[PDB]
Design a protein around this ligand. Structure first.
Ligand SMILES: N=C(N)NCC(=O)N(O)[C@@H](CCC(N)=O)C(=O)NC[C@H]1O[C@@H](c2c[nH]c(=O)[nH]c2=O)[C@H](O)[C@@H]1O
Ligand SMILES: [Mg+2]
Ligand SMILES: [Mg+2]
Ligand SMILES: [Mg+2]
Ligand SMILES: [Zn+2]
Lengths: 57, 170, 94, 338, 30, 52, 110, 1111
DNA sequence: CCTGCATCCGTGAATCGAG
DNA sequence: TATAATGGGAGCTGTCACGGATGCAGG
């Protein structure tokens, strides 16, 4: 866009790129019900992790 | 596809203020038809709603009383002008309508850069916000004068162009 | 532009809250017949007619004007909704 | 003298200092006097206003003798067909440049109030590329497949084109029309993609309380000189203006607090301090680091670029973001034919 | 077709109330 | 301000024997210059009858 | 019959059934007029007494939605069928005089 | 007025008949004027010959014939009939055993005939069959995008006739053949043809490492019959490999002349490409009991020779106009005639084995319906069958020269790509590189060049002047693209003294590439610069000074020009303006030399040299397809002596034989108070006073009284519950009188229909009882005036049932049509444009005193913005303004040929001569120089526009030569601070007017399933709020405005009824309910057996149907 | 027996107008 | 309600570039 003479805030691109990194992949289930290779949202897996690692699991 | 929505050819309106747009009396009559009916009954142009609507359905049955009544109707109220394609949020903007003779919509020059609309035959749609809530949203958030900068770059989106630049530069 | 729009944006934490306040106040006024207004007789928004100047039929104009006065209270959980409604109908019959 | 840029900076500064309403009145005023003065200015367009420089003929002769010298260097087998092709393109490119600069130098010196030059300088209408086609040589046209023709259009729109030059021109013109007609379907498609992936992103809370941030570089590591140099102005402005500092930055005897919404002048100051060498990168609250669920927060976002003030909670950012990204893509595709 | 959760549809600003000082005092004392 | 032709219903008609269409005849009647000698006279209805 | 999915134009963006209006569902004008008629009729029946208006409301079927004979209305109010027919004549005649003076229900004649 | 022309180019041949691609094609396909015995084998005749005879009883074909049309042209346009002719066919039924011969002439229905101008009439509507462009049949070799050194061989027959065949060398060594999505070794197919390892070794052995992959010992191990059976098992799996069955399939797939058909053009193309000759148009033959090869061996030869790198073998450009051909109207209609005739043949074969095997006649055995349906299908619901553009004569003229890549057998919009959409070097002189739609069809839809015609094979040929040595022969040679690529063709503007080439180094073309070459190497020469562009592009003066893009606009907009009542020919012409009105049948001319007897508005009677009296009825005020009034106006007086080909009556948009698409107005190029801001245009009120840009438009209003099971629909003056004031202009039968004025709401034709059965609501029952008036039995369904329309009724056509001559479609009693016209002046919003691409709308109509004016007191007509010129790069209108100014004061018009037109110094000369008339008049009237002229001159010599020191007259002349004059602002009296370019420009009023477009809707019709408002002005529909407009509201954050559009203003039923009720009661709008379209989504998802439940926070089901969907 | 590459099938391909 | 009749018929060939699943030979 810069080359075409378009001033556009990086902010907006950051919004979309943020949505691209919204998902993660499991490398090890641990004590969870998740499977190796299963893909899920990062927020949900950090919510599960805070519910597990605080449970002692 | 929605009700209370018209469409006509746009025409430059240099005389208009930034918050205004020209609108045909014919379009305004139909777009505000129920409002016009109530206001007509409030005055002495018709006994009730049924007779008033029967009156409007014939062109030769129209007298100047319904025009001045319509003037009382749309006062303070605004409409929404939209120009396809709608590429960003300023593709729709709120304007206070100014009733004009003719079948054309007058558009303020400075927003022609925001709509990306020239007058080589372009058309525009006119949507009428009904509720007081929708009216408040348009007059505050969507009003043309209330949006002077681009949400993209932060730079002035409504700025002097063409004739204006030429004259001041001269 | 709407009169004193910058002051109105300064009154609230978000411009959409301003929109809600204006809309709801305009609803109160339109329903109660403009007799619950805090606008003094000289502050009443007028409209030029062929006869003479009458009051502005647009309730939204009244709402933003009342908001400029600073005689209104805006916020959340200030009063039971049913109480506010029936009390406003008590003071100003509709 | 007032032109597009100076007037633009005026509108922006008026918006900051005096607010929306007064700026709107300024806009109506500039509109009025602008129109009123333009109509009595006397600006017209005749065929004599496209001034063909005396240099053009000389550059044509020079290019022709250089052309035959390349042919002289070809028929003897000194260079390849690819080599003569690249040298012919380079020749007519340099010739084109020399002619264009000759047009505008002649305009500035001899006819400084000439309509074409006025509408170009003020930014009221055209750019040197179009004006060149009116006065100097049209330049090189390209084959629809790509690349470029060996034979350029030597004429102008004032001199009149040969039917061959017009035909070669129709090749490129068709591609331009096809761009605004068909190619736009790709950009608009991308726009809808961006919307659907960002549609649920809204400013929800004031602060997510994240201790994280991003480092916005003020210097780019060049490959040419292999040393970090200052980035372009507008680029840094696009990455700093309307943002919020997550760390305090103190340069040039100025304190920039944590949570400070960087104004345009704050950014300009940071650039000048970068030229001083006191700071090489700027810590800032970013949506990349924001931990607000189902959207972003007010502090991580920053200014609502339309109001140049802290973003109102409730503003649908994701839609605006998607729109503002896809809009220039589609819009520029419509302007390919210009 | 419901009210979208943004702008005037955001729960942050949606439940805001308006009251004139005359009615304000009327309910306060009662 | 007004024109009536016998056996002619509207402006878009065509008169038998007459080369000019009604629209053209009316257009020619626009060019007509009629002077009123009497200032008290605000309207005049002319008559025309010709054939062959 | 012909298909509603019949192509209109050389593009695929238009269908035949898109140009066909619904004749069944009442337009907002119809529903509003019907409501205005019911309100104006009740405004007209309030220019009568409650008894002589109830005779008519039971006679033409405004209430309950049933038209009754003179024997049933007489079996309800407790008077003779000729008294009921007399009351309905008086009520209709009063509504005629009310109509001749007010000029309200005239526009609803359709 | 005097007509002065320019140019040194003398074009030998005149332009060919412009409508020749229609008329000459269709006639060639019919041969209706050709005696059946002397008929050749083409079109309809070829269709009969190819479909006949029928094997199994033997039905044979003899000859056909076409009778005369049951009705004339205008009678068909009137009665909504089809212009056609009866088709009879001589058939003799011959029994192959008995020898019984029964001969009869059967009737096959009617065949639509083409009018003189080249159009058709389908059910009362003029229609143009647009020619189609496609890949020519034959053998092409295209490089394989996968493997660089390998190539793809393609064998293509005619569309719909036979499959495409792909020959490709696989990485495993063996050559493959692809037919009907099936691949197999080509070796097997070669074996079936009777080929051996010997023949292929001696023939293909020239190229090593190639034919060895073609060598397979297991293939030659089996006889031709065995290989045939093997091949059938490959192409037809599951189907029993019976010998005669395999023979039937393979023969029908390849050798059958009836099923598989190469083009006669494709036949020649294959012959020239492979250097061989083909007996028939099939790839193979069935002769002496087996299959004999024709095409496959030479193709495989060329393919292997191509892969090896053997000289003399090239690939093929598929966008080359030597490999692309045109299917005209005749061939398209013939192809569909072939299909329908084939279906009729299937009916014959079916009915022969049925019924009596003894007693049958050609009449009994023939069913005409398949043929009728096929022809009627092609002329109606086909894509290439389009609504005729009758806007102006040029519109239809261009329409008949349109070329489409779309339609059946063509390209799909998604199957297109921009490779075919581009311009090729072969488009030179054949297809216009300028004219094209700027819509989605860009590149696909094009126009034919002027001097170009289409030969019998279907390719486009262009004329070229013969050049031998230095002498240029007056003879012309029309060449194909492949043939043109052979020679060196110079330019048309190359210097010629007599017939001899003058230049030392001429500009020429070798295979599209420009080359500076010697006159001794020149083989041919361009006939004229005019051959490169289309007809419309030829109507643009100073074309070489315009950008190609705006030239596209100019060519397209001239098609959109509405015929004005005071329309005049352009002051600056190109020369083709007369010829256009000639080839188009708008005008009217005299057949032979003679004198004029009668002159009238209705008719023109002329006595010729023959002495015979010929009367020409004139078309007057007839509504076209677009509504533009088409009338012919007499241009001769009684007793006028004319000659052969002299003008009798000027048609629509024509002035003295010349084309008049607009009007010559005095223009001024200057900014004006922002009223011309961004392409906007300011006009004078004087344009309305003298009725410039005024045109008549007619509209057709139809109504049908039909038979209902509830009772008949009656058209009468009796309409229930109406005032006499509304029944004013109606006659006693219910029709409005001719000549009356109608406005929106008025009744054109009154009609009554019995009410649908329904219990009248108790409110209505009481209301009837009160008013003492029984409910009328009928109901008012009248044809009224649509909002924003109206005018004066000029005609009324009433058709009924029971009265002679007229019978309507079943159920319909009487059909009544009303023709309402109107004269439209120029108003704010209408679209004005010139020939150079400059376009815009009227933004302001100033009173004459506000208008900028000349020193002599003459006000300008149009105020154009100079800002529109530089960015758009069209300087043609500038020169048109200059020469228009010189021609304004000299009082003469001009002809400036494209690329050969007038050049600047000559225009300076004419301007100077005009200046003498301008100022010489002033100084002769005893008037010196104006003081404001002095100030203007001062600022002018500061502008460097005039030389300082010279007398004001010398300076004013110096400005006038530049095209600029002194202008006075009407509002001030003060002059404009600078000199302004002023002159006459030819400006047109386009078809796009605010009267046709402006629309507004409160509430109206809603769709059936979706229950959302309809669309379009015609249906009184609402405006579409797309998902992008939703995004716009979302981005704004306006939730209640969006919720409005999604519910109350569209899809919510209860909400919108309560909304309308609230507004007319003065009450605020109600809270929006759940949309109906979502309920439709729910039930449509339930139809897919997917349960969709709306829930609360307690996860307990919520019923949005409110108990109506639950038992 | 398991990774890697070739290959198959199914899915997309801007907006609004009118038609 | 009865001679006997016993495996179909027309294909649409000039888009393209992606993700993901199937299957193949190769280490
Ligand atoms: N019939 C059509 N589409 N003509 C296109 C046209 O006249 N335009 O001016 C086009 C392109 C120029 C050209 N001729 O190639 C045009 O730019 N119109 C102005 C705006 O209209 C919009 C538009 C135009 N044409 C399109 O095909 N799609 C569009 O979205 C764009 O937003 C564009 O910015
Ligand atoms: Mg435009
Ligand atoms: Mg069709
Ligand atoms: Mg892939
Ligand atoms: Zn955050």
């Amino acid at each position: 866009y810069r080359a075409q003479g378009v001033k556009l805030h990086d902010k907006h691109i950051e919004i979309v790129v943020r949505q691209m990194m919204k998902y993660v992949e499991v490398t090890d289930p641990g004590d969870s019900r998740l499977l190796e290779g299963q893909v899920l949202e990062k927020w949900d897996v950090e919510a599960l992790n805070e519910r597990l690692i605080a449970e002692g699991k | 596809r929605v009700d209370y929505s018209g469409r006509s050819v746009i025409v430059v309106g240099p005389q208009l203020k930034l918050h205004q747009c020209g609108l045909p009396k014919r379009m305004a009559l139909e777009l505000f038809k129920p409002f016009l009916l109530k206001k007509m009954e409030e005055k002495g142009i018709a006994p009730n709603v049924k007779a008033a609507r029967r009156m409007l359905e014939r062109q030769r049955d129209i007298k100047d009383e319904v025009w001045d009544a319509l003037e009382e109707v749309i006062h303070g109220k605004v409409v929404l002008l939209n120009r396809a394609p709608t590429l960003h949020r300023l593709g729709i903007q709120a304007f206070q309508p100014v009733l004009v003779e003719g079948q054309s919509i007058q558009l303020h020059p400075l927003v022609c850069e925001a709509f990306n609309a020239d007058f080589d035959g372009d058309q525009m749609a006119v949507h009428v916000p009904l509720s007081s809530f929708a009216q408040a949203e348009a007059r505050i958030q969507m009003l043309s004068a209330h949006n002077l900068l681009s949400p993209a770059s932060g730079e002035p989106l409504a700025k002097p162009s063409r004739d204006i630049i030429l004259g001041l530069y001269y | 532009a709407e009169p004193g729009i910058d002051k109105l944006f300064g009154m609230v934490d978000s411009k959409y809250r301003l929109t809600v306040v204006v809309a709801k106040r305009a609803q109160q006024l339109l329903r109660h017949g403009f007799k619950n207004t805090v606008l003094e007789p000289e502050e009443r928004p007028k409209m030029q007619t062929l006869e003479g100047l009458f009051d502005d039929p647009n309730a939204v104009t009244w709402a933003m004007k009342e908001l400029l006065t600073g005689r209104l209270v805006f916020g959340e959980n200030l009063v039971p909704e049913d109480r506010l409604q029936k009390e406003m109908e008590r003071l100003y019959p509709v | 003298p007032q032109e597009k840029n100076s007037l633009k900076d005026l509108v922006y500064q008026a918006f900051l200092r005096l607010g929306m309403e007064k700026t709107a009145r300024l806009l109506d005023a500039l509109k009025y006097y602008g129109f009123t003065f333009s109509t009595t200015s006397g600006i017209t367009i005749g065929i004599d206003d496209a001034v063909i420089p005396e240099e053009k003929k000389q550059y044509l002769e020079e290019a022709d003798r250089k052309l035959l010298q390349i042919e002289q260097a070809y028929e003897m087998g000194f260079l390849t067909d690819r080599e003569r092709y690249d040298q012919i393109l380079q020749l007519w490119t340099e010739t084109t440049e020399k002619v264009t600069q000759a047009v505008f130098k002649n305009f500035e010196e001899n006819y400084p109030f000439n309509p074409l030059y006025v509408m170009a300088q003020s930014g009221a209408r055209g750019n040197p590329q179009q004006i060149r086609q009116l006065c100097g040589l049209r330049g090189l046209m390209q084959k629809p497949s790509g690349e470029t023709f060996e034979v350029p259009v030597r004429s102008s729109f004032r001199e009149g084109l040969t039917v061959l030059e017009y035909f070669i021109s129709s090749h490129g013109a068709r591609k331009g029309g096809a761009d605004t007609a068909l190619r736009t379907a790709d950009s608009g498609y991308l726009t809808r993609k961006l919307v659907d992936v960002t549609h649920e992103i809204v400013v929800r809370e004031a602060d997510c309380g994240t201790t994280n941030y991003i480092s916005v570089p003020l210097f780019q590591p060049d490959e040419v000189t292999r040393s970090l140099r200052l980035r372009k102005r507008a680029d840094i402005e696009a990455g700093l203006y309307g943002r919020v500092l997550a760390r305090e930055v103190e340069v040039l005897g100025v304190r920039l607090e944590e949570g400070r919404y960087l104004s345009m002048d704050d950014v300009h100051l940071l650039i000048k301090a970068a030229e001083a060498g006191e700071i090489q990168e700027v810590p800032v609250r970013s949506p990349l680091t924001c931990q607000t669920r189902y959207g972003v927060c007010q502090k991580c976002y920053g200014y609502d670029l339309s109001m140049a003030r802290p973003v109102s909670i409730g503003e649908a950012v994701g839609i605006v973001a998607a729109q503002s990204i896809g809009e220039p893509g589609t819009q520029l595709t419509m302007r390919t034919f210009h | 077709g419901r009210l979208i959760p943004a702008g005037t549809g955001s729960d942050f600003v949606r439940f805001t109330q308006v009251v004139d000082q005359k009615t304000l005092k009327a309910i306060e004392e009662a | 301000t007004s024109v009536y032709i016998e056996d002619v219903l509207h402006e878009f008609s065509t008169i038998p024997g007459v080369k000019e269409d009604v629209v053209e005849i009316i257009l020619n009647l626009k060019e007509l210059v009629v002077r009123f000698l009497n200032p008290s006279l605000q309207t005049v209805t002319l008559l025309l009858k010709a054939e062959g | 019959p012909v298909s509603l999915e019949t192509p209109i134009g050389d593009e695929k963006d238009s269908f035949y059934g898109d140009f066909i209006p619904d004749e069944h569902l009442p337009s907002p004008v119809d529903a509003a007029t019907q409501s205005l008629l019911s309100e104006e009729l009740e405004k007209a029946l309030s220019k009568l007494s409650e008894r002589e208006a109830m005779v008519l409301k039971l006679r033409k079927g405004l209430i309950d939605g049933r038209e009754h004979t003179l024997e049933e209305v007489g079996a309800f109010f407790g008077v003779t069928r000729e008294r009921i027919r007399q009351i309905e004549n008086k009520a209709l005649r009063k509504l005629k005089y009310h109509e001749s003076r007010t000029r309200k229900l005239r526009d609803f004649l359709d | 007025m005097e007509i002065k022309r320019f140019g040194r180019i003398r074009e030998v041949i005149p332009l060919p008949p412009l409508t020749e691609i229609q008329v000459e094609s269709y006639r060639r396909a019919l041969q209706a004027d050709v005696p059946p015995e002397k008929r050749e084998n083409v079109g309809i005749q070829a269709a009969f010959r190819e479909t006949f005879p029928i094997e199994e009883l033997v039905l044979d074909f003899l000859e056909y014939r076409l009778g005369e049309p049951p009705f004339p042209q205008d009678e068909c346009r009137e009665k909504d009939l089809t212009y056609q002719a009866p088709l009879y066919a001589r058939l003799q039924l011959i029994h192959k055993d008995t020898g019984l011969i029964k001969e009869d002439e059967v009737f096959l229905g009617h065949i639509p005939l083409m009018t003189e101008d080249g159009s058709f009439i389908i059910n009362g509507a003029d229609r143009v069959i647009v020619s189609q462009i496609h890949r020519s049949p034959g053998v092409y070799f295209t490089p394989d995008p996968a493997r660089p050194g390998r190539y793809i061989a393609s064998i293509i027959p005619l569309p719909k006739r036979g499959p495409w065949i792909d020959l490709e060398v696989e990485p495993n060594g063996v050559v493959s053949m692809k037919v009907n999505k099936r691949k197999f070794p080509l070796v097997l197919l070669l074996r079936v043809l009777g080929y051996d390892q010997e023949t292929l070794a001696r023939e293909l052995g020239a190229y090593g490492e190639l034919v060895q992959g073609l060598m397979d010992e297991s293939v030659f191990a089996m006889r031709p019959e065995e290989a045939l059976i093997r091949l059938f098992t490959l192409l037809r799996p599951g189907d029993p490999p019976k010998r005669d069955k395999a023979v039937a399939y393979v023969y029908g797939l390849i050798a059958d002349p009836r099923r598989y058909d190469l083009g006669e053009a494709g036949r020649y193309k294959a012959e020239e490409k492979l250097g061989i000759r083909l007996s028939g148009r099939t790839l193979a033959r069935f002769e002496d009991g087996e299959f004999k090869d024709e095409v496959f061996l030479p193709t495989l030869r060329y393919l292997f020779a191509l892969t090896a790198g053997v000289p003399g073998h090239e690939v093929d450009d598929i966008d080359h106009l030597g490999n692309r051909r045109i299917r005209t109207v005749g061939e398209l209609m013939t192809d569909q005639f072939r299909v329908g005739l084939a279906r009729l043949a299937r009916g014959v074969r079916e009915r022969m084995l049925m019924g009596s095997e003894d007693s049958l006649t050609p009449a009994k055995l023939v069913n005409s319906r398949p043929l009728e349906a096929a022809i009627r299908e092609f002329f109606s619901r086909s894509q290439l069958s389009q609504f005729k553009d009758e806007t102006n004569p040029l519109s239809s003229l261009r329409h008949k020269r349109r070329i489409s890549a779309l339609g059946p057998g063509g390209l799909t919009r998604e199957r297109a790509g921009f490779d075919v959409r581009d311009v090729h070097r072969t488009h030179y002189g054949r297809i216009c590189p300028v004219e094209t739609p700027e819509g989605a069809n860009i590149g696909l839809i094009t126009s034919l060049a002027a001097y170009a015609r289409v030969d019998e094979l279907g390719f486009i040929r262009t004329p070229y002047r013969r050049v031998v040595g230095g002498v240029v022969t007056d003879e012309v040679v029309y060449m194909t693209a492949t043939e043109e690529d052979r020679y060196t063709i110079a330019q048309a503007n190359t210097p010629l003294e007599g017939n001899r080439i003058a230049a030392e180094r001429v500009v020429a073309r070798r295979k599209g590439e420009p080359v500076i070459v010697s006159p001794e190497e020149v083989e041919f020469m361009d006939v004229s610069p005019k051959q490169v562009f289309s007809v419309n592009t030829n109507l643009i003066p100073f074309l070489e000074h315009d950008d190609a893009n705006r030239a596209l606009m100019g060519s397209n907009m001239q098609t959109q020009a509405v015929p004005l009542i005071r329309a005049q020919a352009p002051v600056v012409m190109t020369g083709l303006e007369e010829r256009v009105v000639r080839d188009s049948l708008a005008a009217l001319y005299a057949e032979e030399d003679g004198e004029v007897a009668k002159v009238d508005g209705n008719r023109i009677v002329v006595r010729y040299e023959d002495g015979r009296l010929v009367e020409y009825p004139l078309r007057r005020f007839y509504r076209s397809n677009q509504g533009t009034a088409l009338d012919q106006r007499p241009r001769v007086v009684v007793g006028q002596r004319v000659r052969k080909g002299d003008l009798l009556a000027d048609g629509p948009a024509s002035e003295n034989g010349f084309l008049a698409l607009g009007q010559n107005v005095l223009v001024a190029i200057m900014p004006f108070d922002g009223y011309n801001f961004e392409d906007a245009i300011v006009i004078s009120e004087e344009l309305l006073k003298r009725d410039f840009y005024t045109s008549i438009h007619i509209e057709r209003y139809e109504i049908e009284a039909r038979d209902t099971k509830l009772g008949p629909e009656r058209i009468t003056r009796d309409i229930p519950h109406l005032s006499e004031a509304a029944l004013r202009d109606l006659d006693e039968e219910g029709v409005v009188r001719i000549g009356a004025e109608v406005k929106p709401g008025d009744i054109l034709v009154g009609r009554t229909s019995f009410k649908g059965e329904s219990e009248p609501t108790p409110e209505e029952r009481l209301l009837r009882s009160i008013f003492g008036e029984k409910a009328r039995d009928v109901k008012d369904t009248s044809l009224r005036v649509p909002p924003g329309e109206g005018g004066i009724v000029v005609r009324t056509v009433r058709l009924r049932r029971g009265d002679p001559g007229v019978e309507l479609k079943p159920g319909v009693r009487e059909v009544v049509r009303v023709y309402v016209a109107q004269k439209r002046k120029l108003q704010v919003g209408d679209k004005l444009a010139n020939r150079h691409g400059n376009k815009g709308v009227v933004a302001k109509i100033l009173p004459v005193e506000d208008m900028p004016h000349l020193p002599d007191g003459t006000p300008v007509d149009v105020i154009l913005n100079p800002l529109g010129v530089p960015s758009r790069m069209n300087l043609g209108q500038i020169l048109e303004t200059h020469l228009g100014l010189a021609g304004y004061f000299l009082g003469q018009r001009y002809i400036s040929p494209i690329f050969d037109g007038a050049k600047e110094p000559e225009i300076k000369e004419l301007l100077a001569q005009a200046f003498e008339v301008y100022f010489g008049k002033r100084k002769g009237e005893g008037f010196g120089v104006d003081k404001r002229e002095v100030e203007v001159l001062r600022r002018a010599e500061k502008l460097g526009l005039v030389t300082p020191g010279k007398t004001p007259e010398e300076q004013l002349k110096e400005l006038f030569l530049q095209g600029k004059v002194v202008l006075y602002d009407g509002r001030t009296g003060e002059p404009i601070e600078g000199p302004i370019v002023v002159g006459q420009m030819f400006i047109m009023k386009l078809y796009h007017m605010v009267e046709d477009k402006m629309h507004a809707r409160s509430t109206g019709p809603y769709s059936l399933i979706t229950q959302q408002p309809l669309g379009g002005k015609a249906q009184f529909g609402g405006q579409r709020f797309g998902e992008m407009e939703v995004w716009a509201l979302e981005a704004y954050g306006a939730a209640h405005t969006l919720q409005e559009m999604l519910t109350l203003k569209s899809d919510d039923i209860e909400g919108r009824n309560a909304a309308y009720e609230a507004i007319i009661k003065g009450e605020d709008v109600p809270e929006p309910s759940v949309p109906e379209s979502f309920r439709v989504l729910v039930k449509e998802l339930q139809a897919l057996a997917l349960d969709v439940q709306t829930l609360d926070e307690k996860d307990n089901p919520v019923d949005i149907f409110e108990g109506l969907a639950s038992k």
